[PDB]
């Protein structure tokens, strides 16, 4: 509350330590659904169903760019990457599986890095 703070966790190297989860997650085999953003106009359903369209690019922009706040609302941008994944595709599919690979993947090296 007012004058009374927890402890300061040292954030100073959050910035880069993200970059390098993401480039981690790029170089990933099974990245290839995730590069780029989906092509609305050729993938019948993904505009309307898909609500918050999100890949590793367009993280990579906003994180380049300064518009993650803080770490966690870069976590919250690759979550939605996976969620909108399996949305959309079944699970026995080649990206259904590349989605849950690479969201184990990633959470990993989330709670490795920052837990």
């Not at 040292?10 to 995730?34: G, N, Q, R, V, Y």
Request: aromatic share 10%.
């Amino acid at each position: 509350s007012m004058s009374v703070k927890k402890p300061k966790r040292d954030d100073s190297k959050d910035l880069a330590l993200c970059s390098m989860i993401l480039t981690e997650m790029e170089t990933h085999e099974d990245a290839w659904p995730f590069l780029l953003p989906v092509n609305l106009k050729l993938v019948p359903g993904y505009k309307k169903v898909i609500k918050k369209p999100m890949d590793f690019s367009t993280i990579r922009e906003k994180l380049s760019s300064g518009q993650y706040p803080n770490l966690e609302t870069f976590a919250l941008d690759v979550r939605l990457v996976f969620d909108n994944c399996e949305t959309f595709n079944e699970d026995d599919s080649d990206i259904g599986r590349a989605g849950h690979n690479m969201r184990k993947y990633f959470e990993k090296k989330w709670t490795d890095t920052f837990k």
